[PDB]
């Protein structure tokens, strides 16, 4: 059975090199493979073909920081001078008789990117939404690194647990992280309090924003 084995994750620091591995099952140790990259949020793109003899052929436009190599049943993708944009899922793939198969993918984390505190903006319910007899507070959390935060909501100063939805941080175009938190209320609840608060904790420091009806 043709199998490509990839371990699910790999890690290395900004500016370093990393060697990702793809292992062919024993009966297919002489096969060529292709490497594909899938940056978070987008479709896959082809990187290169790695041949049995160790030669590799990059796709048009793929940076020369990407190279490939072979050792027995191992097929490698070496990425040098790691940049933030290299955080992605990397899939190996091969060709068989009437079949193609993918490895399980390897998620690469690039460690040690520059630290950044989040910018927080809290939006009250829009007049349009209130006119539609609904109310959402939107807490926007921008431009932070590393990509983990916790969010705490308060009404007048009392914690609010119900009706909170928070997204998992994802990378922005500038390679910093963003996240969003939503607090759902009725219009009467919104209008009944003096204020609502969104408090974001990031690397042990808190940033808080308040809005009033």
């Amino acid at each position: 059975q043709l199998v490509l084995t990839q371990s699910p994750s790999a890690s290395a620091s900004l500016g370093a090199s990393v060697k990702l591995t793809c292992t062919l099952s024993s009966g297919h140790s002489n096969y060529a493979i292709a490497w594909h990259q899938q940056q978070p949020g987008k479709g896959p793109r082809y990187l290169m073909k790695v041949n049995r003899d160790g030669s590799h052929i990059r796709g048009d436009g793929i940076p020369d920081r990407f190279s490939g190599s072979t050792s027995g049943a191992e097929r490698y993708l070496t990425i040098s001078s790691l940049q933030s944009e290299d955080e992605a899922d990397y899939y190996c793939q091969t060709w068989g008789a009437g079949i193609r198969v993918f490895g399980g993918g390897t998620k690469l984390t690039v460690l040690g990117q520059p630290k950044a505190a989040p910018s927080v903006t809290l939006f009250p319910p829009s007049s349009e939404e209130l006119q539609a007899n609904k109310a959402t507070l939107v807490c926007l959390i921008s431009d932070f690194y590393p990509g983990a935060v916790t969010v705490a909501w308060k009404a007048d100063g009392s914690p609010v647990k119900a009706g909170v939805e928070t997204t998992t941080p994802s990378k922005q175009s500038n390679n910093k992280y963003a996240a969003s938190s939503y607090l759902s209320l009725t219009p009467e609840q919104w209008k009944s309090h003096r204020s609502y608060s969104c408090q974001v904790t990031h690397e042990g420091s808190t940033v808080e924003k308040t809005v009033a009806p």
Binding site: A34, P44, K49, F123, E165
Partner: protein
Amino acid sequence: QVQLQESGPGLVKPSETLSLTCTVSGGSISGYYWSWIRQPPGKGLEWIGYIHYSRSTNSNPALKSRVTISSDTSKNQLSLRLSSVTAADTAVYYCARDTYYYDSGDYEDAFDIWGQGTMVTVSSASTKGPSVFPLAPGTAALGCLVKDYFPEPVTVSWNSGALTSGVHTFPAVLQSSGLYSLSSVVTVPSSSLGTQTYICNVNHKPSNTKVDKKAEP
């Protein structure tokens, strides 16, 4: 300049047949194998099958009983039909340009161009277009709140695609209603607040909903 574009419905009901097309531009489908691939949300890539217009077609043994792949030379298109769908078939579906076979009969293995992918959700729930609300504002954030739509995705551009900077469109949240909501935000100079207008262009293809909303002070 060869490009691949998948299309099909974003929503099909369980037990129905999913029908997708892969339209090739900038070159001919002749001579190449063309592959179909899919990716369930958050999971890996699964090869579905392939076709060469004058050689063969085949598919993954786990899916072969439900998969029919064909080609249309006049339209320069490949197609995929997946029958008896269930929630396990919810995925983004891709086509890719695969191995090229020369007239001699020899070939060179390849898998070098991907389409953009098209998102398919298998559900009995009905399509619903979003409600869009502005998030009103030396730097300032403004945005649009895109509420209560189904299925995914919605795309949000700003100023008819002419604004491409501090734009970030967040992942959607799945609410207990079974509907999705997301927000799209842009960071703009405070000095351009009384000057430039900011309009989010919200597209929800499964309901063919199109909404422009101004985010104003």
